[PDB]
Amino acid sequence: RVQHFTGYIEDGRGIFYSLPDMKQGDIIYASMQNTGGNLDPLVGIMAEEIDPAVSLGQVLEKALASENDLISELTAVADRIFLGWDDDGGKGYSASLEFTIPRDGTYHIFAGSTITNQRLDKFQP
């Protein structure tokens, strides 16, 4: 059972995908690859659909003002928002995820952009 999707991400505004009525014991697989631009894929899975924008924005708020160590603050926030996630598990910066369906019900898949730095003259997430 394989399905394809294509989309566009603008300024860290993610896209939700619905997985209606999965059964306990199923295994979900995900992979997200960049096909244009400077996008850095991120994927997460959760039960109740809530917009991560408000929570992820505080991570950019903290790093922009201090040291804060982004890789620490992002992991802590992600481990709360999502039941499972992956940043760079694939070839390059592409993500890949394996997730065993805990119980019976429906879940949501979140695709979007992570917080990264892409400069060597100065640090700016």
Binding site: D69, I71, Q118, K122
Partner: protein
């Protein structure tokens, strides 16, 4: 003289087609790398850097690291210069680690471990905490690969 370069080695056991140079892998393995039975060689380097008024940001590129390797670095000021910030990023700028201030707050240390097949790392040292023109602040940088003993090296910089 000697010679340098990369090589491909094909070993066979009771497989007379190997001497032709075209033997495809088959069967169950019989030989392994010998170096894996002990500890890897350490490489240590020490450098002195200075952050001028217009040169408060500095970056250094590191050679490729094999999977399973480890990376360490520490910075200690020459004198009363304030402690700068330290972080580790790849060649694209993706962060990997951040420096930790020790309880005897006179130096900063950094640590990382290798997961991918090849890692190209960049070490960032900056003193742009504000806009003060402190002048001629100078720091000492010590770095090592597979060398967790950078705190008390003892030996002169070994390896490459």
């Amino acid at each position: 003289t000697y010679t340098t370069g990369s090589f491909q080695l094909i070993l066979g056991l009771n497989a007379p087609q190997v001497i032709s140079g075209e033997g495809e892998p088959e069967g169950e393995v019989f030989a392994s790398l010998a170096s894996l039975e002990i500890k890897p060689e350490a490489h240590v380097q020490e450098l002195e850097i200075r952050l001028d008024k217009d040169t408060r940001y500095l970056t250094q590129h590191t050679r490729n690291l094999q999977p399973g390797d480890t990376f360490h670095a520490l910075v200690e000021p020459i004198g009363e210069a304030p402690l700068p910030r330290l972080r580790l990023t790849d060649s694209g700028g993706k962060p990997l680690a951040f420096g930790l201030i020790d309880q005897p707050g006179e130096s900063v240390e950094l640590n990382y471990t290798c997961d991918q097949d090849i890692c190209e790392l960049v070490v960032h040292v900056d003193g742009t905490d504000g806009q003060k023109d402190s002048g001629e602040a100078v720091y000492r940088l010590l770095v090592g690969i597979n060398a967790p003993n950078l705190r008390e090296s003892g030996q002169t910089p070994v390896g490459s």
